[PDB]
Amino acid sequence: TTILAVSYNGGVVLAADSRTSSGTYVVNRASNKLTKLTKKIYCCRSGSAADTQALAERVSNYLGSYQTDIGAGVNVATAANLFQKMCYMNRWNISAGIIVAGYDPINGGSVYSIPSGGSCVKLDYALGGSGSIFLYSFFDANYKPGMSKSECVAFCQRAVAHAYSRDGSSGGLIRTITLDADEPEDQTIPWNRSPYCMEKDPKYVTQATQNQPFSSSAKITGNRMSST
Amino acid sequence: GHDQSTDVFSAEGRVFQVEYAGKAVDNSSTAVAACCKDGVVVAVEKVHTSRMLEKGSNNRIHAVDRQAGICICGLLPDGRAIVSRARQEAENSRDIFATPIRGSVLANRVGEFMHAYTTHFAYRPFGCSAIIASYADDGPQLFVSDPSGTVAGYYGVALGKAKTVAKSELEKLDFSSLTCDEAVGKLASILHEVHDKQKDKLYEVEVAWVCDKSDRKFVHVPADMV
């Protein structure tokens, strides 16, 4: 899993790969890990599909009740707070990295990370999933904040692609959604138009030279490609 | 036997035990309140029976959260029960929803709670009207929940024994223009006019506001403005 969210001026992007794996087999290659909580507030789920689907459904339910009751929009902080509560109450029995991100008119776009222990941290961007370990340096090196919506979408797609090109546990599509004052725009990049992969990076086209032919010299030539 | 329990309708669909609790509120000391564009001011006439109370005794105005307060009118103990419930709702909003409770929400919650005690043979209605004054994200707001649990928003409001007069005086104010500074003066002034002197010889007027000058915190007003 690779999930992330990034703020831009006036909203957020969420992004995720689509793969759900039972270890080394892919049970679902088109999962949707961007889960709607309210109209403009989403979570990205990582960890146990079961656990995260159960919490998201629970929180989305509570939040719809709550919106009907106060007769007004919900804040992202409220959604994060609830998520945090539930994640923390059940921290021993669930595996669950969440990101809660969305747009509310009081605070603009926000991002909260709620990692396994049930901390809740408000950030500019957040990463989660097994694939996130690959993006920390990518962000450190290549993410400048203050990006436009469209730049930010493309950057999150790149970021996911980089992650899932190295994490065996992430893969497939890249789903994104933006969340701001306007209508949510979901997007889905199929793998074969991924903005990065190792199988198409020109610096990984030359094969490692492992299968040298038997020679009278130490000079390395190439792999032996043919018997003759 | 139609009027002994709040669990019972009369033949005209009235609930007498609620009307009766209502009378407790009307025979009580008077409160007024005004909701301006910059905040809410609520004032209330405390009637002492003794010359020897401490100033502060039997406060009828309670904070319920940073941004909200409840002035009770009627049986003060019953009101402190409501104030406790309002505070639990305010806490819940902060603890679960990580937001200050909007005032309309708070007053609805207060109303629901008061109404609940008008449905069941085992409890009686509360003998107090709560005035709720909030200034959360929904803006300045002033509600009143009566013993039936009916809740209404007001620009200005008067409860208790001088309510009919105090309303006549509150109608003379211009709510569109009036500011929390002016209102502390007016609302207090009003409670001095409608106070009856030969009955209730000992009285202070407690005032509180929540407004832009108080950093939208609900507080007793300093006793220089009165």
CSV table of N, CA and C in Angstrom, one decimal, chain B residues 122-198:
chain,number,residue,atom,x,y,z
B,122,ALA,N,-42.1,9.1,36.2
B,122,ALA,CA,-41.1,9.1,37.3
B,122,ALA,C,-40.3,10.3,37.5
B,123,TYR,N,-40.3,11.3,36.6
B,123,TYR,CA,-39.6,12.5,36.8
B,123,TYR,C,-40.5,13.6,36.7
B,124,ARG,N,-40.2,14.7,37.2
B,124,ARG,CA,-41.0,15.9,36.9
B,124,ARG,C,-40.3,16.8,36.0
B,125,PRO,N,-41.0,17.7,35.3
B,125,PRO,CA,-40.3,18.8,34.5
B,125,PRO,C,-39.5,19.7,35.4
B,126,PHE,N,-38.5,20.3,34.8
B,126,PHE,CA,-37.6,21.3,35.4
B,126,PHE,C,-38.4,22.5,35.6
B,127,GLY,N,-38.1,23.2,36.7
B,127,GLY,CA,-38.8,24.5,37.1
B,127,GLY,C,-37.9,25.6,36.7
B,128,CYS,N,-37.3,25.6,35.6
B,128,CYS,CA,-36.4,26.7,35.2
B,128,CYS,C,-36.3,26.8,33.7
B,129,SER,N,-36.2,28.0,33.2
B,129,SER,CA,-35.9,28.3,31.8
B,129,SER,C,-34.4,28.6,31.8
B,130,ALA,N,-33.8,28.0,30.8
B,130,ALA,CA,-32.4,28.3,30.6
B,130,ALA,C,-32.3,29.3,29.5
B,131,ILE,N,-31.6,30.4,29.6
B,131,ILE,CA,-31.1,31.2,28.5
B,131,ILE,C,-29.7,30.8,28.2
B,132,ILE,N,-29.5,30.4,26.9
B,132,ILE,CA,-28.2,30.0,26.4
B,132,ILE,C,-27.7,31.1,25.5
B,133,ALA,N,-26.5,31.5,25.7
B,133,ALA,CA,-25.8,32.6,25.0
B,133,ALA,C,-24.5,32.0,24.5
B,134,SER,N,-24.3,32.0,23.2
B,134,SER,CA,-23.2,31.3,22.6
B,134,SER,C,-22.6,32.4,21.7
B,135,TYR,N,-21.3,32.1,21.3
B,135,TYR,CA,-20.7,32.8,20.3
B,135,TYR,C,-19.7,31.9,19.8
B,136,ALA,N,-20.1,30.9,19.1
B,136,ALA,CA,-19.2,30.0,18.5
B,136,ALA,C,-19.3,30.3,17.0
B,137,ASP,N,-19.0,29.3,16.2
B,137,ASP,CA,-18.8,29.5,14.7
B,137,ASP,C,-20.2,29.8,14.1
B,138,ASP,N,-21.3,29.5,14.7
B,138,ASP,CA,-22.6,29.9,14.2
B,138,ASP,C,-22.9,31.4,14.5
B,139,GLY,N,-22.0,32.1,15.2
B,139,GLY,CA,-22.1,33.5,15.4
B,139,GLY,C,-22.7,33.8,16.8
B,140,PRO,N,-23.0,35.1,17.2
B,140,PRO,CA,-23.8,35.3,18.4
B,140,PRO,C,-25.2,34.7,18.4
B,141,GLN,N,-25.5,34.0,19.4
B,141,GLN,CA,-26.8,33.3,19.5
B,141,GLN,C,-27.4,33.4,20.8
B,142,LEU,N,-28.7,33.5,20.9
B,142,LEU,CA,-29.4,33.6,22.2
B,142,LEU,C,-30.6,32.7,22.0
B,143,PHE,N,-30.6,31.6,22.8
B,143,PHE,CA,-31.8,30.8,22.8
B,143,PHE,C,-32.4,30.7,24.2
B,144,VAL,N,-33.6,30.3,24.2
B,144,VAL,CA,-34.2,30.0,25.5
B,144,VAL,C,-34.9,28.6,25.4
B,145,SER,N,-34.6,27.8,26.3
B,145,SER,CA,-35.2,26.5,26.6
B,145,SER,C,-36.1,26.6,27.8
B,146,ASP,N,-37.4,26.4,27.7
B,146,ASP,CA,-38.3,26.5,28.8
B,146,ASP,C,-38.6,25.1,29.4
B,147,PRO,N,-39.3,24.9,30.4
B,147,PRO,CA,-39.5,23.6,31.0
B,147,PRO,C,-40.2,22.5,30.2
B,148,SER,N,-40.9,22.9,29.2
B,148,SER,CA,-41.4,22.0,28.2
B,148,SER,C,-40.3,21.4,27.3
B,149,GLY,N,-39.2,22.1,27.3
B,149,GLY,CA,-38.1,21.8,26.4
B,149,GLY,C,-38.2,22.5,25.0
B,150,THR,N,-39.1,23.4,24.9
B,150,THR,CA,-39.3,24.1,23.7
B,150,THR,C,-38.2,25.1,23.6
B,151,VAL,N,-37.6,25.3,22.5
B,151,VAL,CA,-36.3,26.1,22.4
B,151,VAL,C,-36.6,27.1,21.3
B,152,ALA,N,-36.2,28.4,21.6
B,152,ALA,CA,-36.4,29.4,20.5
B,152,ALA,C,-35.2,30.3,20.5
B,153,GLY,N,-34.9,30.8,19.3
B,153,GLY,CA,-33.8,31.8,19.2
B,153,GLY,C,-34.4,33.2,19.4
B,154,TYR,N,-33.7,34.1,20.0
B,154,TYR,CA,-34.2,35.4,20.2
B,154,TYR,C,-33.2,36.4,19.9
B,155,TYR,N,-33.6,37.6,19.5
B,155,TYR,CA,-32.8,38.8,19.5
B,155,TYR,C,-32.8,39.3,20.9
B,156,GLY,N,-33.9,39.4,21.6
B,156,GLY,CA,-33.9,39.8,23.0
B,156,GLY,C,-35.0,39.0,23.7
B,157,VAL,N,-34.9,38.9,25.0
B,157,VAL,CA,-35.7,38.0,25.7
B,157,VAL,C,-35.7,38.4,27.1
B,158,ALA,N,-36.9,38.1,27.7
B,158,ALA,CA,-37.1,38.4,29.1
B,158,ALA,C,-37.9,37.3,29.8
B,159,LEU,N,-37.5,36.9,30.9
B,159,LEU,CA,-38.2,35.9,31.7
B,159,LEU,C,-38.4,36.3,33.1
B,160,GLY,N,-39.3,35.5,33.7
B,160,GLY,CA,-39.6,35.8,35.1
B,160,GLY,C,-40.7,36.7,35.4
B,161,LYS,N,-40.7,37.4,36.5
B,161,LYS,CA,-42.0,38.0,37.0
B,161,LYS,C,-42.2,39.3,36.3
B,162,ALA,N,-41.2,40.0,35.9
B,162,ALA,CA,-41.4,41.3,35.3
B,162,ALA,C,-41.3,41.1,33.8
B,163,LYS,N,-41.7,39.9,33.3
B,163,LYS,CA,-41.3,39.6,31.9
B,163,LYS,C,-42.1,40.5,31.0
B,164,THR,N,-43.3,40.7,31.2
B,164,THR,CA,-44.2,41.4,30.3
B,164,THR,C,-43.7,42.9,30.2
B,165,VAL,N,-43.4,43.5,31.3
B,165,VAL,CA,-42.8,44.8,31.2
B,165,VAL,C,-41.5,44.8,30.5
B,166,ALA,N,-40.5,44.0,31.0
B,166,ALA,CA,-39.2,44.0,30.5
B,166,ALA,C,-39.2,43.8,29.0
B,167,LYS,N,-40.1,43.0,28.5
B,167,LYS,CA,-40.3,42.9,27.0
B,167,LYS,C,-40.7,44.2,26.4
B,168,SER,N,-41.6,45.0,27.0
B,168,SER,CA,-42.0,46.3,26.5
B,168,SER,C,-40.7,47.2,26.4
B,169,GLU,N,-39.8,47.1,27.3
B,169,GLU,CA,-38.6,47.9,27.3
B,169,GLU,C,-37.5,47.5,26.4
B,170,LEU,N,-37.5,46.1,26.1
B,170,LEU,CA,-36.6,45.5,25.2
B,170,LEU,C,-37.0,45.8,23.8
B,171,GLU,N,-38.3,46.1,23.6
B,171,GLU,CA,-38.8,46.3,22.2
B,171,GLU,C,-38.3,47.7,21.7
B,172,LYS,N,-38.1,48.6,22.7
B,172,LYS,CA,-37.6,49.9,22.4
B,172,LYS,C,-36.1,49.9,21.8
B,173,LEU,N,-35.4,48.8,22.0
B,173,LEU,CA,-34.0,48.7,21.6
B,173,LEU,C,-34.0,48.3,20.1
B,174,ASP,N,-32.9,48.8,19.4
B,174,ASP,CA,-32.7,48.5,18.0
B,174,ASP,C,-31.6,47.4,17.9
B,175,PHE,N,-32.1,46.2,17.6
B,175,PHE,CA,-31.2,45.0,17.7
B,175,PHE,C,-30.2,45.0,16.6
B,176,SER,N,-30.5,45.6,15.4
B,176,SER,CA,-29.6,45.6,14.3
B,176,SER,C,-28.4,46.4,14.6
B,177,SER,N,-28.6,47.5,15.5
B,177,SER,CA,-27.5,48.5,15.7
B,177,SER,C,-26.8,48.3,17.0
B,178,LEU,N,-27.5,47.7,18.0
B,178,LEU,CA,-27.1,47.7,19.4
B,178,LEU,C,-25.8,46.8,19.5
B,179,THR,N,-24.9,47.3,20.4
B,179,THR,CA,-23.6,46.7,20.7
B,179,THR,C,-23.6,46.2,22.1
B,180,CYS,N,-22.6,45.3,22.4
B,180,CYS,CA,-22.6,44.7,23.7
B,180,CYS,C,-22.3,45.7,24.8
B,181,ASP,N,-21.5,46.7,24.5
B,181,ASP,CA,-21.2,47.8,25.4
B,181,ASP,C,-22.6,48.4,25.8
B,182,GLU,N,-23.4,48.8,24.8
B,182,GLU,CA,-24.6,49.6,25.1
B,182,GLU,C,-25.5,48.7,25.9
B,183,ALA,N,-25.5,47.4,25.5
B,183,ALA,CA,-26.5,46.5,26.0
B,183,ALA,C,-26.3,46.2,27.5
B,184,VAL,N,-25.1,46.1,27.9
B,184,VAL,CA,-24.9,45.9,29.3
B,184,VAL,C,-25.6,47.1,30.1
B,185,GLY,N,-25.5,48.3,29.6
B,185,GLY,CA,-26.1,49.4,30.2
B,185,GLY,C,-27.6,49.3,30.2
B,186,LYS,N,-28.2,49.0,29.0
B,186,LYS,CA,-29.6,49.0,28.8
B,186,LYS,C,-30.3,47.8,29.6
B,187,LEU,N,-29.8,46.6,29.4
B,187,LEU,CA,-30.3,45.5,30.0
B,187,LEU,C,-30.3,45.6,31.5
B,188,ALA,N,-29.2,46.1,32.0
B,188,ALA,CA,-29.1,46.3,33.5
B,188,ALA,C,-30.1,47.4,33.9
B,189,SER,N,-30.2,48.5,33.1
B,189,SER,CA,-31.1,49.6,33.4
B,189,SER,C,-32.5,49.0,33.5
B,190,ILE,N,-32.9,48.1,32.5
B,190,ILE,CA,-34.2,47.5,32.4
B,190,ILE,C,-34.6,46.8,33.7
B,191,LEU,N,-33.7,46.0,34.2
B,191,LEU,CA,-33.9,45.2,35.4
B,191,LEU,C,-34.0,46.1,36.6
B,192,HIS,N,-33.5,47.3,36.6
B,192,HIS,CA,-33.7,48.2,37.7
B,192,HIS,C,-35.1,48.8,37.6
B,193,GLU,N,-35.6,49.1,36.4
B,193,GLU,CA,-37.0,49.7,36.3
B,193,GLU,C,-38.1,48.8,36.7
B,194,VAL,N,-38.0,47.5,36.4
B,194,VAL,CA,-39.0,46.5,36.5
B,194,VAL,C,-38.9,45.8,37.8
B,195,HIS,N,-37.8,45.9,38.5
B,195,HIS,CA,-37.7,45.5,39.9
B,195,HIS,C,-38.7,46.2,40.7
B,196,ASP,N,-39.4,45.5,41.5
B,196,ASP,CA,-40.4,45.9,42.5
B,196,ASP,C,-39.8,46.0,43.9
B,197,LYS,N,-39.8,47.1,44.5
B,197,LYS,CA,-38.9,47.5,45.6
B,197,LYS,C,-39.5,47.1,47.0
B,198,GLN,N,-40.8,47.2,47.1
B,198,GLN,CA,-41.5,47.0,48.4
B,198,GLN,C,-41.7,45.5,48.7
